[PDB]
Amino acid sequence: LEACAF
Amino acid sequence: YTRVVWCAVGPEEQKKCQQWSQQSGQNVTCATASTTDDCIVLVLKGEADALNLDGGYIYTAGKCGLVPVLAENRKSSKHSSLDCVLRPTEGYLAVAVVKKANEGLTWNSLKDKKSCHTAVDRTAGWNIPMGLIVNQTGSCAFDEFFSQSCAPGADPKSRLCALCAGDDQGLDKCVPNSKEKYYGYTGAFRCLAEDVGDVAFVKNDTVWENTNGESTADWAKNLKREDFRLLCLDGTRKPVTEAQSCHLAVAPNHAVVSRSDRAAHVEQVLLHQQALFGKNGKNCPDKFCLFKSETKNLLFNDNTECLAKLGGRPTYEEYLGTEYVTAIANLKKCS
Numbered sequence: 001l002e003a004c005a006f
Numbered sequence: 007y008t009r010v011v012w013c014a015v016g017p018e019e020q021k022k023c024q025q026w027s028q029q030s031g032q033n034v035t036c037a038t039a040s041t042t043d044d045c046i047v048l049v050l051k052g053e054a055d056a057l058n059l060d061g062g063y064i065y066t067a068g069k070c071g072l073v074p075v076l077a078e079n080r081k082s083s084k085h086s087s088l089d090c091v092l093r094p095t096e097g098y099l100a101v102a103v104v105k106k107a108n109e110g111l112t113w114n115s116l117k118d119k120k121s122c123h124t125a126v127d128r129t130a131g132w133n134i135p136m137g138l139i140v141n142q143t144g145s146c147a148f149d150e151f152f153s154q155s156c157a158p159g160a161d162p163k164s165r166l167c168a169l170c171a172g173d174d175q176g177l178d179k180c181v182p183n184s185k186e187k188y189y190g191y192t193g194a195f196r197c198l199a200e201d202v203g204d205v206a207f208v209k210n211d212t213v214w215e216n217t218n219g220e221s222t223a224d225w226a227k228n229l230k231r232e233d234f235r236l237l238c239l240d241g242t243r244k245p246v247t248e249a250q251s252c253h254l255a256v257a258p259n260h261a262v263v264s265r266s267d268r269a270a271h272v273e274q275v276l277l278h279q280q281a282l283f284g285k286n287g288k289n290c291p292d293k294f295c296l297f298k299s300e301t302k303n304l305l306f307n308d309n310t311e312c313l314a315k316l317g318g319r320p321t322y323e324e325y326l327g328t329e330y331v332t333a334i335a336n337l338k339k340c341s
């Protein structure tokens with residue numbers, strides 16, 4: 001699901 | 007003042023990009039990074055405006071808030087009366103390829119073989135095949151399926167990198183950019199062609215573009231399609247002419263992503279830029295061809311006809327399709 005990998 | 011900063015991945019793309027900058031009167035300039043993720047970081051920081059991405063990276067970029075601007079559109083059949091820039095993209099075929107002579111090798115006997123991937127995180131080279139394998143084996147230990155592999159972007163000392171060869175001086179082994187001999191669609195296919203690997207995860211077009219004289223590169227100039235077979239999911243092996251009925255999936259076209267507030271400008275620029283250096287661009291092949299790079303696929307895939315406007319102002323999820331997005335989400339639950 002969501003959340004930017006950086 | 008609408009100057010567009012492009013992100014080149016690796017010294018070879020940087021090279022091509024600088025020529026493009028030069029030819030563009032610097033309406034397009036170049037920022038460079040060692041990996042596609044680095045490039046995505048640069049764009050998030052605004053040290054770069056855009057870059058062309060494989061669906062798998064579109065997913066990374068999309069979660070970070072970047073949006074699709076234009077998509078790669080290659081030669082088509084139907085819809086062809088319409089302008090390439092207005093045509094719906096039709097996606098590409100992700101396939102599993104092996105040597106015909108490697109008889110008795112099927113989808114169902116890939117365990118402990120040698121594999122060649124375009125790179126970790128990419129659609130045809132990784133997300134689709136690994137997603138399928140993880141699911142079918144009911145296990146997340148995908149770094150233990152094949153005995154050895156070359157999957158650029160993985161731990162250089164791991165077996166997922168054992169087959170990668172690094173640059174012509176043997177440095178940079180397994181980097182996820184074109185310095186790695188077996189990187190991308192072409193590198194992976196080559197990894198199979200030289201028998202380093204038993205199977206290559208690329209797309210349908212790659213097999214055709216580097217066989218039967220379609221590529222004069224030394225490792226490919228002498229390859230014949232008949233010597234290769236596609237592995238269908240039902241366990242059968244078919245000639246590379248049957249990809250339509252023997253593929254792992256249909257993948258969304260690679261596409262350009264940028265920040266939102268730069269998306270309109272980046273779009274305007276690229277529409278103009280390809281008019282100049284695109285397919286029938288007014289200055290290709292004369293001065294510079296934006297979609298050519300001696301088959302190395304630098305910046306854009308070599309078989310790209312044009313970058314096409316997207317219908318529906320699609321979010322990255324709408325572009326990639328709920329199904330693919332879910333497949334990725336699911337595979338990523340593994341590491």
Ligand SMILES: *[C@@H]1O[C@H](CO)[C@@H](O[C@@H]2O[C@H](CO)[C@@H](O[C@@H]3O[C@H](CO)[C@@H](O)[C@H](O)[C@@H]3O)[C@H](O)[C@H]2NC(C)=O)[C@H](O)[C@H]1NC(C)=O
Pocket residue numbers: 133134137138141328329332333336
């Ligand atoms: C590997 O397995 C995973 C897990 O099954 C696959 O994800 C599953 O994908 C299906 C089909 O896209 C999802 O279902 C659909 O459900 C929605 C309603 O939620 C419905 O509108 C659609 O019409 C469709 O029925 C399912 O939710 C999803 N499961 C999970 C846990 O996310 C994945 O596709 C597989 N990977 C590959 C590469 O095939």
Ligand SMILES: *[C@@H]1O[C@H](CO)[C@@H](O[C@@H]2O[C@H](CO)[C@@H](O)[C@H](O)[C@H]2NC(C)=O)[C@H](O)[C@H]1NC(C)=O
Pocket residue numbers: 081082083099210211212214215220247248249250309
């Ligand atoms: C798999 O890829 C090949 C290569 O792109 C496709 O064949 C090309 O088809 C166009 C028309 O679609 C021809 O004009 C080209 O000359 C073909 N290329 C070569 C090198 O022959 C092929 O159609 C694809 N197959 C499927 C099922 O999509």
Ligand SMILES: *[C@@H]1O[C@H](CO)[C@@H](O)[C@H](O)[C@H]1NC(C)=O
Pocket residue numbers: 029030031033279
């Ligand atoms: C660069 O941008 C300007 C501004 O729109 C345009 O008039 C010019 O034709 C462009 N030149 C090239 C080579 O892109």
Ligand SMILES: O=C(O)Cc1cnc2ccccn12
Pocket residue numbers: 318320323324325326327328329330
């Ligand atoms: O919504 C869209 O406009 C496109 C789209 C979104 N989600 C899917 C799933 C499968 C095929 C096309 N999709």
Ligand SMILES: [Fe+3]
Pocket residue numbers: 060061128129130131257260
């Ligand atoms: Fe791809």
Ligand SMILES: [Zn+2]
Pocket residue numbers: 253255256
């Ligand atoms: Zn299908």
Ligand SMILES: [Zn+2]
Pocket residue numbers: 318319320321324
């Ligand atoms: Zn929408």
